[PDB]
Amino acid sequence: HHWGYGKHNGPEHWHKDFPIAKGERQSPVDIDTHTAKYDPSLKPLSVSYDQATSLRILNVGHAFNVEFDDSQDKAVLKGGPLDGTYRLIQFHFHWGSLDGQGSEHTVDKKKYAAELHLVHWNTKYGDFGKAVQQPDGLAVLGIFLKVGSAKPGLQKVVDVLDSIKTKGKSADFTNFDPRGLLPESLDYWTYPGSLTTPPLLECVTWIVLKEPISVSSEQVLKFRKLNFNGEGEPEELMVDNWRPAQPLKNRQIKASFK
């Protein structure tokens, strides 16, 4: 039926409805740190989130999205391997049922407890819908989460999850500062890829940060209390909403550090 992360509709089944699932630049991938190429040509990332305007948090069924006002250049990403300005539209996470899994990208086969994706679109295309149809339409900042000390800046997100437990539920979520979710260092790996959920379009320039952020066991535990289902339907806990690593094929992963 509809795609998901279950046994009968999981990632291994997606290709039937979305043939591009077996494409040439699919994500996520395993980042082999010894085969990655240091590129001195890469510029530092420029993250300008000081004027970010968050608007709402919504349970979209396969995850929850924190949406931002993208009608102006309020929260933008520039620099790095990017040409132009990319506006932040939403961020979401991928996590597991256990602390030993949950991330989509892996580093030398190592899996993290979760992965944060900050999605941005290239302003030269006018809107998000047009951007996803272009090879350089989106830029996604990926951040790994490891279990350890609590992340203060994440608690505001954690506390509102009870109000959007089921699919379709939304809640006002204003004045949230995404800067509180960033690690100290902005060193990164980058490669051309795709969205990791259907339609799996190959329109993404991935920027994966090397430094993970730490969150507490209690914080991630609350992520695991969400539901894939809508209210009234049989409860299905929202866990393991991650796609496994895909073949790198004819691609090179570049590093901004040596």
Ligand SMILES: [Zn+2]
């Ligand atoms: Zn994602």
